[PDB]
Write a protein that binds this DNA or RNA. Structure first.
Ligand SMILES: Nc1nc2c(ncn2[C@H]2C[C@H](O)[C@@H](COP(=O)(O)OP(=O)(O)OP(=O)(O)O)O2)c(=O)[nH]1
Ligand SMILES: [Ca+2]
Ligand SMILES: [Ca+2]
Ligand SMILES: [Ca+2]
Length: 341
DNA sequence: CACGGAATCCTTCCCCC
DNA sequence: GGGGGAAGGATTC
């Protein structure tokens, strides 16, 4: 079983460079402006010129500017990156019928057939890297291993613009040497929980009673880590399908006034519906980000599909339900549609 | 100072054999 | 007791 994972380098920023080469070599910061005030918002991503100075995804735009006041700041253009991403996924498809598009810039390929060993896998990787660079002029990192997880870990190790194979010999040393926090699916919350249990390496998950592990991080997560640690994780590359579409926006000022919030909510529904394109949802959820960045939501599932009029009507009720049950002011408001017919 | 889309899994009900 | 779902939240990429 050989999996090849492809992860595009500093994607949003690299696309902006491709579309305007004069940016190359300079620090480029792709931002999401919230409109609350001068430069309010977060950084979606930045190229490596900017990252070596601390500017990276997640930090506030205002803080990025204090560090790199002369960098180039650009508004994120999601749609454009999505279309470039699509073209790249189509190139990868020609290397394997079994492909898993994990996100706007990640994909796993089951090349167990196309190749007979790791040496050949590596060469297919270079072939893929070269093809993408030539065709779209975008550099990517390739990870290759026994399964999806280590394939991803491989890429994480070799980026940017790299390629790496993690052989069965290395898998084992990683199972005993890799910081468990570096395992995909293990965020800050799960890592801390695992620390308190004395587990700092995948190998430590076998020196614990299952039920105690399950009780701490959940069964699904417990079985996941245990299979990896036992070198038995073996999930298949499957084509994922969109299950929900939605949109959430930030209001200029926090609020509790139904008539002040409605506009942002209806705007979110509008964009959500234009995106549903032919897909009809039976479920709707109104999502709110309180002033203390907490996330609360109220939704409803219907026995039939939801017409746009119904969505406008039902969303107002759900928003009223939110305000009634939660006294905090609202900062971000939006909707999400799911359970497509 | 901290935007944004979405999948999955966990708890707590709730209806009903 | 447990199958079947729905809600609201937790967690991660
Ligand atoms: N709005 C927003 N977009 C994000 C955020 N974090 C990541 N993204 C986008 C950034 C990338 O263009 C794309 C994710 O790839 P990362 O896995 O983020 O890789 P990126 O390509 O930026 O880093 P890299 O140098 O290739 O390893 O998802 C975030 O916090 N906010
Ligand atoms: Ca990337
Ligand atoms: Ca990625
Ligand atoms: Ca981590």
């Amino acid at each position: 079983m050989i999996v090849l994972f492809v992860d595009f380098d500093y994607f949003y920023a690299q696309v902006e460079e491709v579309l305007n080469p004069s940016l190359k070599g300079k620090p480029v910061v792709v931002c999401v402006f919230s409109g609350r005030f001068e430069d309010s918002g977060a950084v979606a991503t930045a190229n490596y010129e900017a990252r070596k100075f601390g500017v990276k995804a997640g930090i506030p735009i205002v803080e990025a500017k204090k560090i790199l006041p002369n960098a180039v700041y650009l508004p994120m253009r999601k749609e454009v990156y999505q279309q470039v991403s699509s073209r790249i996924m189509n190139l990868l498809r020609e290397y394997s019928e079994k492909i898993e598009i994990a996100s706007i810039d990640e994909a796993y390929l089951d090349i167990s057939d196309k190749v007979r060993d790791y040496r050949e896998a590596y060469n297919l990787g270079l072939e893929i890297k070269n093809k993408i660079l030539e065709k779209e002029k975008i550099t990517v990192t390739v990870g290759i291993s026994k399964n999806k997880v280590f394939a991803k870990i491989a890429a994480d190790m070799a980026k940017p613009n790299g390629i790496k194979v993690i052989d069965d010999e290395e898998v084992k040393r990683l199972i005993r040497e890799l910081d468990i926090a570096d395992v995909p699916g293990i965020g800050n919350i799960t890592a801390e929980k695992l620390k308190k249990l004395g587990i700092n390496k995948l190998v430590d998950t076998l020196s614990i009673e299952f039920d105690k592990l399950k009780g701490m991080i959940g069964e699904a997560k417990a079985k996941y880590l245990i299979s990896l640690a036992r070198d038995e994780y073996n999930e298949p590359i499957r084509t994922r399908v969109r299950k929900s579409i939605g949109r959430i926006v930030t209001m200029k000022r926090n609020s509790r006034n139904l008539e002040e919030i409605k506009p942002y909510l209806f705007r979110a529904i509008e964009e959500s519906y234009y995106k549903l394109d032919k897909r009809i949802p039976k479920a709707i959820h109104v999502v709110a980000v309180t002033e203390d960045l907490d996330i609360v939501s109220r939704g409803r599932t219907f026995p039939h599909g939801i017409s746009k009029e119904t969505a406008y009507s039902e969303s107002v009720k759900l928003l009223q339900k939110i305000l009634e049950e939660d006294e905090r002011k609202i900062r971000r408001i939006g909707v999400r549609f799911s359970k497509f017919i």
